């Protein structure tokens, strides 16, 4: 033929069949032992998610949400993702004492449901009403963005203490139980309005620590609705929403490390 005879062509096939078969069987074996060394409830390493990311619902083309108020299908793209998220926080999804629980309607302290063990059933998560998100189809004019803190197993978000000076200096400082979120731009051509649990501009600490998908399915993380009823129009406004805390940090590279990058433009 090309290389060899039929007899040789066969033998080279019988070899590579057994050979690659063995190699596949060995590869799988090493994957088995790897998995055997891992927990079902908690990942081996968590230093790469460490400082929590802050992500929002409006799917930004490039950290930007520009549209026209005087146009219907101009914002119907951002309403798709906005709906996708809030559709999960339905009351019909949170039914019965299992696996949900009614928690303080005001920001409270942490809740420990034991260890990362299966020695108990599904760890009961705090309910969250999308109805706590006042004012927010969504904002056809002047968007109503929804913030979110990235989930990390066993992470206890710790707010800053009012020992020294603060950006939003001491205003509504629920020091003991709220992780604040203050959006900014100089360039003050807007109108910041925050909505959340208990009416505070933060995340209620009663939703922590997260026990993971395996130990807490259907779990709901707290949301923080933000509305920009800015009196300006037809210009790119670089708005940055920042979260503050002891376990919260940022990076010049990762522009989502505990903060937002939104470029709103109501070009109408």
């Amino acid at each position: 033929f090309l290389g060899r005879t039929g007899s040789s062509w066969f033998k080279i096939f019988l070899f590579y069949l057994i050979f690659y078969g063995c190699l596949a069987g060995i590869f799988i074996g090493t994957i088995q032992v790897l998995l055997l060394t891992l927990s079902d409830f908690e990942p081996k390493y968590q230093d790469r998610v460490a400082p929590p990311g802050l992500s929002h619902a409006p799917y930004a083309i490039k950290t930007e949400i520009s549209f026209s108020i005087s146009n219907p299908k101009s914002y119907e793209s951002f309403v798709k993702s906005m709906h996708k998220l809030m559709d999960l926080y339905n009351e019909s999804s949170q039914a019965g004492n299992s696996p949900f629980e009614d928690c303080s309607d005001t920001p409270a302290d942490y809740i420990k449901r034991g260890d990362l063990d299966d020695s108990q059933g599904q760890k009961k998560a705090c309910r969250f009403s999308r109805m706590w998100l006042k004012n927010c189809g969504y904002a056809e004019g002047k968007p109503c963005v929804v913030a979110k803190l990235n989930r990390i197993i066993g992470f206890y978000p710790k707010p800053l203490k009012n020992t020294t000076d603060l950006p939003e200096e001491l205003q509504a400082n629920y020091n003991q139980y709220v992780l604040p979120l203050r959006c900014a731009a100089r360039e003050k051509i807007g109108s910041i309005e925050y909505f959340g649990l208990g009416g505070y501009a933060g995340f209620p600490l009663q939703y922590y620590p997260y026990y993971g998908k395996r130990l807490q399915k259907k779990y709901l993380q707290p949301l923080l609705a933000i509305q920009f009823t800015n009196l300006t129009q037809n210009m790119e406004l670089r708005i940055e929403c920042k979260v503050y805390g002891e376990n919260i940090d940022y990076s010049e590279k990762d522009r989502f490390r505990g903060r937002f990058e939104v470029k709103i433009e109501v070009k109408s």
Binding site: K11, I26, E42, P43, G53, S55, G212, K213
Partner: protein
């Protein structure tokens, strides 16, 4: 074009002096007119040689920039700029990826260009050396007056004059001469002075006395002649053009390189476009379809391989430089290993090029002297009183002297003023009797008759050094038979005795044997003149026989020859044991050529020519079956009337071939004949008459000390110490480097698979990219470099000089067996070890292997800063990318770890590491430096930006260890099978 120049020349030495003048419109006495000479100048053109048109270095450099790998790397470099252009227009990408990768790849092409350019070097100044043989000026007779003119202004027809010490300015017809002798070594390779006279003495113009040639010099006397040829039209000017004009051609090693380039280029374009369409079918945007292709290019092309080859060659050439063997062309480092036929000059190559005493006949006994340079033989006789009598004649009846200031150099190597035979005798006595000058001071010469054409003898009368005599001793030497007709007694073991027919017959026997050995034989005799008949003041007349020259006492015979170099016989046998055919090709006479052939082992004992059979059986040569003769001796005059097909039959039908009295073109023809049969041929030589053959040879080797400038220009290799044993070393080195290149190539190729497979699974699996493009270049250009080179220092696995020369048609540098092992077996194991570490990194950070399938879409999505892992955690864009790049880093390090084992297995093709050992210090160096480089690239701060290399946790380093070990075991088991059964299965499938 040069087929005309490969033919024997035609001449006009047969014409009379007068007749020759009519042909050139010339005067025998007055010479040309100033006006007629200038007319002929403009007509024929200058008496000069024009160098052939060369290829500029520009075109030579750029021709390498387009050879398979460079072509693919160019397509990659441009395709980078393509994707970059498409980006800069569409979505403003502030990145530098495609732009920088395009710059990097273009640089890789340029630098790789320098390496191949360095390897494909051609240092040739043939025509320049020939031009150096034309004198600046010549002496001509114009308008009846002699004047010096620019030799280029010399034309056919003018009257030229030459004298001892000057170069022949052009081909001349001798019309007048006085004691003129010439050095025709340019045409023959033999430096013995040849007389020139107006008389025609041979039909063959290269042998007649009435022609003098350009490229030669007058050694003594004076001559006048008419110019018959000028410039390019001279006999050796044509040889110049032939030699300088010959197409170089591709070396065996070069052909091998291009061959695997085709193979690897083939699989590259195959998988390249095979997966380019496979991606579009899967619905991949052309934006991405090209990005994957660039990666495929980089994965398939072994970026550092061609440069490795060059370095391995260079390092092999450095070792040979250290044995006095200079390599002018890097590729010639290997040709000697692939050589199946050596065509060797005799004089100054196989031989020392110096008349040396070989045997002596005295006391009715043949004695042999030591002919070797360094005198590696033994003594023959010292005791016999006869010896001292013969020794005295050899010293006394001798007019040769050592040049001043030689006392530092060895006797046999020092320059001597005199003819070759007298120098030989001088050096013979000086060696075994001490200072000859002393013997010539103790015995003052009073009268002598120098060797005469008519007398055929030379005699001398000396004052006997003996005090009790202080009388007159007569000594003489000459033609053995002439000396015999002048002897009455023979000095036997001390005492004289009558010359009976018995001893006279033993003389003839001794004389015939020595002459049969191709040796020049001389007779020696002396006579103690009677005291009473010769007073202490008796005057001797040299002009008229004033003393007896008959009834003298015969002392002995001495024989001499230009002997082989000490190492030559043994080197010839070694070449022949390695299955190399050795042919002699010489301008010298057949009797001498044949005798040295037997001396060095070109013609082995018992082997006969058709002429030998005929003489032994006493039958006509036509009655001899030529197939009964494995040896042959072909004279150039017969070679001339043979067609190439008939020359091919001679080459095919004889194992032991001697081509004697060959011209320079004839040497070229014999070389081409050998090549025509498909053989790789080496030429060894030292003369300008070897230049065409040396050029045409696959590898020409010139002698460094004895070699002429031309020969060393025409060669690929120079033996700087004239050590012929270096050929044996050269062939051995050549074979070793050929095997080691295979090892180094397999090693380099093996790591291509773990660079290809990640890109494929990236498409077919939709997982995060396991390894990056930059990461690949860190391997092929970084870590693999020193290890790959180090394989050039591997010792032989067996006695390589015991095997036959490779068949260049069947035995390739890269074959299917190499690809099967490198790509199909070992590289495949490396790929898995890479993937394993990849799955380990991701799974330990929260992305278990199961959830990875079909996630790249969301993984690469720059706007999703919340991807969910297996444990329910959310990752930003840059966070997961850090883990991904950490995966690139450990996959990279996995390659390094699996290349550890590969380096050790590529060490040997057959033998076990437990047999070959670990005595390669460069290889071990490679292991340490490779690992140091990898660690540095991972842990050095800032490398995460420039190369996207991230720090690895200690446990990460050990992921591929079990795969590294399986490689070592697998290959060790496999080679154990090879050795345990030379049959073929494992052998014919995987044996590189």
């Amino acid at each position: 074009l040069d087929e005309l120049k490969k033919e024997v020349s035609m001449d006009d030495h047969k014409l009379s002096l007068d007749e020759l003048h009519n042909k050139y419109g010339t005067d025998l006495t007055r010479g040309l007119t100033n006006a007629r000479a200038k007319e002929i100048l403009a007509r024929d053109g200058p008496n000069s040689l024009t160098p052939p048109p060369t290829t500029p270095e520009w075109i030579k450099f750029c021709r390498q920039l387009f050879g398979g790998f460079s072509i693919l790397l160019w397509i990659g470099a441009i395709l980078c700029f393509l994707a970059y252009g498409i980006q800069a227009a569409t979505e403003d990408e502030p990145a530098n990826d495609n732009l920088y990768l395009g710059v990097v790849l273009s640089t890789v092409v340029i630098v790789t260009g320098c390496f191949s350019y360095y390897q494909e070097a051609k240092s040739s100044r043939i025509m320049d050396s020939f031009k150096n043989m034309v004198p600046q000026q010549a002496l001509v007779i114009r308008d009846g007056e002699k004047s010096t003119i620019n030799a280029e202004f010399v034309v056919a027809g003018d009257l030229v004059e030459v004298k001892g010490g000057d170069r022949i300015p052009a081909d001349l017809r001798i019309i007048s001469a006085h004691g003129c002798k010439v050095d025709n070594s340019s045409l023959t390779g033999e430096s013995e002075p040849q007389t020139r006279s107006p008389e025609f003495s041979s039909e063959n113009p290269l042998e007649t006395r009435n022609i003098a040639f350009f490229s030669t010099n007058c050694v003594e006397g004076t001559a006048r002649g008419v110019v018959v040829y000028t410039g390019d039209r001279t006999v050796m000017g044509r040889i110049a053009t032939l030699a300088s004009g010959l197409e170089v051609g591709r070396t065996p090693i070069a052909i091998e390189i291009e061959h695997f380039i085709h193979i690897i280029t083939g699989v590259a374009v195959f998988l390249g476009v095979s997966f380019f369409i496979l991606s579009l079918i899967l619905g991949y945007s052309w934006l991405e379809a090209v990005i994957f292709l660039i990666g495929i290019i980089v994965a398939n092309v072994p970026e550092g391989l061609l440069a490795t080859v060059t370095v391995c060659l260079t390092l092999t050439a450095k070792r040979m430089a250290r044995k006095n063997c200079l390599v002018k062309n890097l590729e010639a480092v290997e040709t000697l290993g692939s050589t199946s036929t050596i065509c060797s000059d005799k004089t100054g190559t196989l031989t020392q090029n110096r008349m040396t005493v070989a045997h002596m006949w005295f006391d009715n006994q043949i004695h042999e002297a030591d002919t070797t340079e360094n005198q590696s033989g033994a003594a023959f006789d010292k005791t016999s009183a006869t010896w001292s009598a013969l020794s005295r004649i050899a010293a006394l009846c001798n007019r040769a002297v050592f040049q001043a200031g030689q006392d530092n150099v060895p006797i046999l190597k020092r320059s001597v003023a005199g003819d070759a035979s007298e120098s030989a005798l001088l050096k013979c006595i000086e060696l075994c009797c001490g200072s000859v000058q002393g013997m010539r001071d103790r015995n003052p010469k009073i009268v002598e008759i120098p060797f005469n054409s008519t007398n055929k003898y030379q005699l001398s009368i000396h004052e006997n050094e003996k005090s009790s005599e202080s009388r007159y001793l007569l000594v003489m030497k000459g033609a053995p038979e002439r000396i015999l007709d002048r002897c009455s007694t023979i000095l036997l073991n001390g005492a004289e005795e009558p010359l009976k027919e018995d001893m006279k017959e033993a003389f003839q026997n001794a004389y015939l044997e020595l002459g049969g050995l191709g040796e020049r034989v001389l007779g020696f005799c002396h006579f103690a003149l009677p005291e009473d008949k010769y007073n202490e003041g008796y005057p001797f007349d040299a002009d008229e026989p004033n003393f007896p020259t008959t009834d003298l006492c015969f002392v002995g015979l001495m024989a001499m020859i230009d002997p082989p170099r000490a190492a030559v016989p043994d080197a010839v046998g070694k070449c022949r044991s390695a299955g190399i055919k050795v042919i002699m090709v010489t301008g010298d006479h057949p009797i001498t050529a044949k005798a040295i052939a037997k001396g060095v082992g070109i013609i082995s004992e018992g082997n006969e020519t058709i002429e030998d059979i005929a003489a032994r059986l006493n039958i006509p040569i036509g009655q001899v079956n030529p197939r009964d003769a494995k040896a042959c001796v072909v004279h150039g005059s017969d070679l001339k009337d043979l067609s190439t097909e008939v020359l091919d039959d001679i080459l095919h039908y004889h194992t032991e071939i001697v081509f004697a009295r060959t011209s320079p073109q004839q040497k070229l023809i014999i070389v081409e004949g050998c090549q025509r049969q498909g053989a790789i041929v080496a030429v060894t030589g030292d003369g300008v008459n070897d230049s065409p053959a040396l050029k045409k040879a696959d590898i020409g080797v010139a002698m460094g000390i004895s070699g002429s400038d031309v020969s060393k220009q025409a060669a690929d290799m120079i033996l700087l110490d004239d050590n012929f044993a270096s050929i044996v070393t050269g062939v051995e080195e050549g074979r070793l480097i050929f095997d080691n290149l295979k090892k180094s190539i397999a090693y380099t190729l093996t790591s291509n698979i773990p660079e290809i497979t990640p890109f494929l699974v990236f498409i077919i699996g939709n997982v995060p990219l396991p390894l990056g493009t930059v990461t690949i270049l860190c391997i092929d250009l970084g870590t693999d470099m020193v290890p790959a080179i180090s394989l050039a220092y591997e010792q032989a696995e067996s006695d390589i000089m015991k095997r036959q020369p490779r068949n260049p048609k069947t035995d390739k540098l890269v074959n299917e067996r190499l690809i099967s092992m490198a790509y199909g077996q070992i590289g495949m194991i490396q790929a898995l070890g890479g993937f394993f570490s990849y799955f380990v990194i991701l799974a330990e950070n929260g992305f278990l292997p199961m959830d990875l399938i079909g996630k790249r879409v969301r993984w690469d999505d720059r706007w999703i800063s919340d991807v969910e892992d297996s444990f329910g955690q959310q990752w930003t864009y840059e966070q997961r990318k850090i883990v991904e790049f950490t995966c690139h880093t450990s996959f990279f390090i996995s390659i390094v770890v699996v290349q550890w084992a590969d380096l050790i297995i590529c060490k040997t093709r057959r033998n076990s590491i437990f047999q070959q050992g670990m005595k390669n210090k460069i290889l071990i160096f490679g292991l340490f430096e490779e690992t140091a480089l990898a660690a540095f690239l991972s842990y050095c701060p800032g490398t995460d930006v420039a190369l996207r290399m991230y720090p690895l946790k200690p446990s990460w380093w050990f992921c591929a260890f079990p795969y590294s070990l399986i490689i070592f075991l697998y290959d060790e088991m496999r080679r154990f099978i090879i050795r345990r059964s030379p049959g073929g299965w494992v052998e014919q499938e995987t044996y590189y």
